Symmetry: C2
Subunit: 354 residues, 2 copies
Amino acid sequence: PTGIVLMNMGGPSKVEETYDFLYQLFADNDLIPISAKYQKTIAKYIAKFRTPKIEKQYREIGGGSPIRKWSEYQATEVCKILDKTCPETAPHKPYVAFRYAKPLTAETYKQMLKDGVKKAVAFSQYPHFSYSTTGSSINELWRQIKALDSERSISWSVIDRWPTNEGLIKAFSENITKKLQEFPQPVRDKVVLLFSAHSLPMDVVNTGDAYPAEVAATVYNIMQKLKFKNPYRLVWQSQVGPKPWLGAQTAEIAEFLGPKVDGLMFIPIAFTSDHIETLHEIDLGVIGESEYKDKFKRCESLNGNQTFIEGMADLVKSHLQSNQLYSNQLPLDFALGKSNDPVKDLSLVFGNHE
Amino acid sequence: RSPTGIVLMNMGGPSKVEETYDFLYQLFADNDLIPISAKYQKTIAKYIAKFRTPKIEKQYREIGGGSPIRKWSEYQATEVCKILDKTCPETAPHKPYVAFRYAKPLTAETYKQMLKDGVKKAVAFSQYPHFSYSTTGSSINELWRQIKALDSERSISWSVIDRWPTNEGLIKAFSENITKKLQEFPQPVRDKVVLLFSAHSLPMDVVNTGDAYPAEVAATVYNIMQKLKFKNPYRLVWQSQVGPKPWLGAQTAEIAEFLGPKVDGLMFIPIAFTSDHIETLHEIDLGVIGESEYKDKFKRCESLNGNQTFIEGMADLVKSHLQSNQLYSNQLPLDFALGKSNDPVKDLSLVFGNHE
């Protein structure tokens, strides 16, 4: 009866859910401000155009996005813990809802009502809030609530951010340390730790989006635990089109530093499991294509790390055990966020209302 | 016992309205950025200087005439050295010194005085908690040029405090100063006041250089909100952007007008500087606040300036640095491999330390 829904953009489970995923992606004006008036029309064009290259990438990494598997694993593992940790909230049923990928919020919501859920928690898998990710996903949830649950059957609450959750910080530091063990001792303290997070379009950044600064907070907290032993730097990956994106591209920095450093390590700072971003962009692109493939290494993604899973369960417990169906920052985010169809009152969306 | 020089550094500000021309000349004579030249800049620098002087003099005129930077810097330095005499006896006589990059006294001037004072050890204490190659990096490159010209036989052993984003006294002074300023807000609406940490912005081509500034400022903001238990909505925004070029966004002014109508309170916090200057006294007080129709619900946090808790923090920072035996943070060699300058330091280990 208690629904724990993990949420993120998603990824195509099979090589061809790609064109559908991509179309859904570019059709969302809340993600990348392409055209407030013709985003969808423009989207199917961009989708039909980018499908070949992307489709080939999912093939070069096994033939699909591992997101769904890892998300389902994490969700149920977190629920098993809450069952023993929060017996006060009876069984905790794991759910997964992706913004663009397969299990869409609409599908998932149907189930939840069919399974008779009364209390639910939208658990954003992005530790750092961005209107483009969590915001978009919340605007979707609102649409679903209205169309699927008019009688306001389910009572929702949202975990909208957690940049410095203990398990998260502790899991990343442990993984960073053991990965450093692969470098030769006399050079270990010199390896540069490049925290690579998905970039953001300057248009979003300039709305005063919360994302940039929150990633920075996670990074610094990790370096404190590591006692600032190594040189570090927060850089950004991805980026699409001519429009400008954020501060120093992971790709350019790596190439520029290659000749100067004893080594480099990439850290998937903004995500919780493996996906096309790490398995391809980083592994086959940045690393497996550089002449320095040797002095280049990547920190393990969180995936099924138990410190991390325990940190998430703890994160949830603190959430359930309190008021606030959302953080103090959310109302400000929606005040600054840009959308054709936004949630006007966060207070009407999350709560009893029955 | 020979004196240990504690040197506070920062870009600077014209002490009095007449300094404006010299300040602006130096600024436009720097080609570590600004122009390219060497032979035809001792010229253009003075042309762009005379061209700007009027505007800038009117600004300082609007703030009581002159920048308060030198005043606060010399004071802070003196207060810090007085504590250090008691706290760090083996470096016994600690002498106050300031060295500005464009304002008086320039690096060369202060260096001459230190050499004539018989200083053996010196600490280049950057006043910026957040390192930027365009600021703390600029000072370090000038220091190097001066060391080579005014002290080729290096009688002085330098070390540098290049950053301190989460020093305890810093985070505590900002907390307290923010709570204090929040209390002069209604009460039924005090928790809803939005805290806008406002820092000097950076051009996008400097940010895309991999510069450290943006992330470190964010580190200070998160730590302050932690102390304050996230009771209030907040956001890190940027100011002072000028020119046709693209700057790091979330424009303070721009965002203040946007939120004005929909919020019942807004506070601006001088998150990246340590005392009053043109940015807070003029840009914010007279611009953002002063000319807005929401002046009433807009307030600015008090600058650290002479804050005692903040001074004690700087003392701890200096004590730790002196007793760590490190000549600079582990980050500095990365900043220099990423920075862009026409005359940079090639070896940081040759710049700092004993070279008898």
